[PDB]
Amino acid sequence: SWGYREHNGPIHWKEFFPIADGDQQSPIEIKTKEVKYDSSLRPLSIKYDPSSAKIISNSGHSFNVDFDDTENKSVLRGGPLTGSYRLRQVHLHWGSADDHGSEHIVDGVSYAAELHVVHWNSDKYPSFVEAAHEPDGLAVLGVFLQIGEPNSQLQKITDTLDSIKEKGKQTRFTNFDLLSLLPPSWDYWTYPGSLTVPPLLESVTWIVLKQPINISSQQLAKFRSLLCTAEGEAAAFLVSNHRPPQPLKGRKVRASFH
Ligand SMILES: CCCCNC(=O)c1cc(S(N)(=O)=O)c(Cl)cc1Cl
Ligand SMILES: [Zn+2]
C-alpha cells in the first residue's frame, strides 16, 4: 500500500493511481510573478465550531483530526468557492528537515510544514465521499508553518502524539479551537488541483494562505515520531510525508490580494 518510503513513495504512486500524471495535480510551485490578482475573488468567511472535532488518529500517513460533518456547524464560505463547504478533517505534512517540509512551495521557499483543512461541497453533493469525485467537490485550506517561537495553539495536538504512535491508534479529541490556529491574515492564492495523496483525485479547489504560523523545531520533531506501521508490524517512522511539486500544465494561480 502507498506511503512515502523508497518503494511505495510519490514516484511510484502512478503505478496504482494513474491520475498521478494528470493535468490538475497538486501540490505546486507558486511563482508569485506569474500569479494573477483577481478582484472578483471574494474574501474567505470561516466558521469553525470547537465542538466539531471528535477524534485524532494516526492514519499511517499523518495525524488526522476527524470532525463530525453531520450538518453545517463548521464551514468555509467565500474565497473562490460557490456555496458552502463543510469541514471534514485536518492533517499536516512535513519533511525530514525543517527547511523543506511543505507541499506548496513559494518562489522556491519550502516551509517547515503545511497544515491541510479539508472541506466538501454539501450545497451540491450528499456526502464527502461523493464530493471527492467531482471537480468542484472539495476545498482545502493550506496553512504554512515556519520555524519560530513555540505555538501554544499546537499544544493540544502535540500532547496526543505519544498516544497515537502506531498506525491505526486513535484518541478522543474535542474542543479543538481550529479558528485560533489560523494566521491573522486570510489573504490567499488559489488554483484547481487534486488530493496530494492517493487516490489523487482532481476534485480540489486549493486555497493557500499567504501568511505562515509558527512552530518550534522541538514541536515539529514530535510529528516524526509517528509510525507509518501498525502494532506488531516492524517499526518505520513517518519522518517525511510531503509530495513533490507537480507540473502546472497551464493552470492559472490567482491571488486574492495585491
Ligand atoms: C486515511 C485516508 C488517507 C488520508 N487522506 C488524506 O489525508 C486526504 C488528504 C487530502 S490533501 N493532502 O489533498 O489535503 C485530501 Cl483533499 C483528502 C484526504 Cl481524504
Ligand atoms: Zn494534505
UniProtKB/Swiss-Prot annotation:
Regulation of its function: Inhibited by acetazolamide.
Enzyme class: lyase
Binding-site positions, substrate: T196, V197
GO cellular component: cytoplasm; cytosol; intracellular membrane-bounded organelle; myelin sheath
InterPro entries according to UniProt: CA_dom, CA_dom_sf, Carbonic_anhydrase_a-class, Carbonic_anhydrase_a-class_CS
Active site: H61
SUPFAM superfamilies: Carbonic anhydrase (SSF51069)
Catalytically driven reaction(s): hydrogencarbonate + H(+) = CO2 + H2O
Tissue expression notes: Expressed in thymus, small intestine, spleen, prostate, ovary, colon and testis.
Domain Alpha-carbonic anhydrase: 1-257
Gene3D superfamilies, alphabetized: Alpha carbonic anhydrase
EC code: 4.2.1.1
PROSITE patterns given in the database record: ALPHA_CA_1, ALPHA_CA_2
Sites where the protein binds Zn(2+): H91, H93, H116
An annotated Gene Ontology molecular function: carbonate dehydratase activity
Record's keyword annotation contains Plastid: no
Keyword Transmembrane helix: no
Superkingdom as given in the UniProt entry: Eukaryota
Cofactor section: Zn(2+)
Keywords: Lyase, Metal-binding, Zinc
Annotated family: Belongs to the alpha-carbonic anhydrase family.
Protein's job: Reversible hydration of carbon dioxide.
UniProt protein name: Carbonic anhydrase 13
Organism: Homo sapiens (Human)
